[PDB]
Amino acid sequence: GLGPLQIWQTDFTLEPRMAPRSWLAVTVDTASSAIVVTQHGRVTSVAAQHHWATAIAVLGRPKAIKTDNGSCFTSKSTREWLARWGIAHTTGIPGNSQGQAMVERANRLLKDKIRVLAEGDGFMKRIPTSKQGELLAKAMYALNHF
Amino acid sequence: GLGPLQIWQTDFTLEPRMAPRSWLAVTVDTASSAIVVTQHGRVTSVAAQHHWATAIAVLGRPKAIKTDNGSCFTSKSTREWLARWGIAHTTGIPGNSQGQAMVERANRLLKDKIRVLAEGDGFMKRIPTSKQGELLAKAMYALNHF
Numbered sequence: 001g002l003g004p005l006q007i008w009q010t011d012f013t014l015e016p017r018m019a020p021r022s023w024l025a026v027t028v029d030t031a032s033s034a035i036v037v038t039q040h041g042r043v044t045s046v047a048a049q050h051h052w053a054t055a056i057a058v059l060g061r062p063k064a065i066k067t068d069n070g071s072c073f074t075s076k077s078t079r080e081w082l083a084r085w086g087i088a089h090t091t092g093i094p095g096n097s098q099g100q101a102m103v104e105r106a107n108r109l110l111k112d113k114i115r116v117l118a119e120g121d122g123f124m125k126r127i128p129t130s131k132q133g134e135l136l137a138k139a140m141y142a143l144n145h146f
Numbered sequence: 147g148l149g150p151l152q153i154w155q156t157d158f159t160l161e162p163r164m165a166p167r168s169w170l171a172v173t174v175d176t177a178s179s180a181i182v183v184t185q186h187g188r189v190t191s192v193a194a195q196h197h198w199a200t201a202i203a204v205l206g207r208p209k210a211i212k213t214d215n216g217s218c219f220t221s222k223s224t225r226e227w228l229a230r231w232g233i234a235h236t237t238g239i240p241g242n243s244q245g246q247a248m249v250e251r252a253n254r255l256l257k258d259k260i261r262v263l264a265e266g267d268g269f270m271k272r273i274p275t276s277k278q279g280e281l282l283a284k285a286m287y288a289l290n291h292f
């Protein structure tokens with residue numbers, strides 16, 4: 001049982017094609033490379049908690065999650081939510097540089113796939129609100145192919 | 147590679163504690179017993195398609211899905227959505243009796259866990275709208291423990 005560590009990297013990335021809920025919260029399980037994404041109207045502490053509750057239902061509970069120092073991830077509210085779950089959190093090392101690189105790469109592959117799938121459906125600018133969820137789901141499936 | 151068949155059972159169950167989006171769409175992968183649930187305001191053909199797009203992002207694409215003859219699953223719109231995905235569908239045998247039993251059992255374990263987790267949080271009647279998603283996510287995690 002000397003298998004990979006159950007550690008996640010999480011980040012928010014802006015995607016105007018998904019407006020009005022244009023902030024995409026993306027989590028990469030570093031142990032399997034699975035990706036989970038959710039959309040939100042604003043980046044708050046509560047959006048990050050909503051995102052991780054879903055990721056937890058999808059990937060199970062991690063031992064730890066690594067984020068940057070964005071304030072939605074470092075407020076007291078977030079620290080308490082993570083403590084209630086027993087999940088450890090680290091924002092890395094002060095002036096990390098790298099070490100968030102996997103989720104930054106997932107952010108980019110994700111936006112590219114949304115753009116090619118959207119354009120494939122004839123949406124060259126914003127994706128109609130009513131079509132967003134299924135297209136976000138399709139991009140997520142295309143990047144995991146469970 | 148003589149491992150289980152990638153066949154899903156899907157159904158809708160009403161849960162007043164989740165009002166106004168009180169119809170829960172539940173899918174059980176019969177190959178692993180994993181469960182995926184989503185909430186909806188009305189049972190339409192489009193609610194079933196929204197539910198399966200999410201399940202597909204979570205469990206990958208199945209070879210087939212088995213449902214009852216509820217009309218949201220048998221309209222032309224649904225038949226076409228499933229055909230676009232290459233997924234086969236069966237509503238079983240005319241007067242099946244059983245053969246949907248796993249998802250009917252998942253419907254019941256699911257509503258029980260929502261009730262115990264809700265009550266654990268002090269919500270004895272409807273769960274506040276703003277608390278529903280995280281509690282639905284928690285019930286889904288509690289029944290899968292990924």
Ligand SMILES: [Zn+2]
Pocket residue numbers: 011012068070
């Ligand atoms: Zn960030």
Ligand SMILES: [Zn+2]
Pocket residue numbers: 040046047050
């Ligand atoms: Zn939210």
Ligand SMILES: [Zn+2]
Pocket residue numbers: 011012013104107
């Ligand atoms: Zn970033």
Ligand SMILES: [Zn+2]
Pocket residue numbers: 145146206207
């Ligand atoms: Zn695939």
Ligand SMILES: [Zn+2]
Pocket residue numbers: 157158214216
């Ligand atoms: Zn039914």
Ligand SMILES: [Zn+2]
Pocket residue numbers: 186192193196
């Ligand atoms: Zn919907």
Ligand SMILES: [Zn+2]
Pocket residue numbers: 157158159250253
């Ligand atoms: Zn039923």
Ligand SMILES: [Zn+2]
Pocket residue numbers: 060061291292
């Ligand atoms: Zn667990």
